[PDB]
Write a protein that binds this DNA or RNA. Structure first.
Ligand SMILES: [Zn+2]
Ligand SMILES: [Zn+2]
Ligand SMILES: [Zn+2]
Length: 84
DNA sequence: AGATAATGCCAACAGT
DNA sequence: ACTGTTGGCATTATCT
């Protein structure tokens, strides 16, 4: 089952390790706000990356597959499918 | 060299 | 089940 539950919100998890991994979220120190939406972040790079997502179209794309990716390394990993 | 910005990895999560 | 997303976070790249 999932006996372990978050104290802050109504969530449940199988084991204490994943429980703590979730429960830390409610208490992290986030000093970096996004000027678009009031969402907070721990590192400024994370905040700027989030700001990227507020743009409608997803920036990165595949030259051959014609897909759309939010982040550079995801496009790089997708490029591995064309090993020939 | 020291401070700050970007990026890659990872786990949690969610659309299909 | 598959595979995209997200934010956190350590590490790397760029700026001063
Ligand atoms: Zn919670
Ligand atoms: Zn925002
Ligand atoms: Zn492709």
């Amino acid at each position: 089952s999932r006996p372990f539950k978050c104290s802050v919100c109504e969530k449940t998890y199988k084991d204490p390790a994943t429980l703590r991994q979730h429960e830390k979220t409610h208490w992290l120190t986030r000093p970096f706000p996004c000027n678009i939406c009031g969402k907070m972040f721990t590192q400024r790079g994370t905040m700027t990356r989030h700001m990227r997502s507020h743009l409608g179209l997803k920036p990165f794309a595949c030259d051959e597959c014609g897909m759309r990716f939010t982040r550079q390394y995801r496009l790089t990993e997708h490029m591995r499918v064309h090993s020939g």
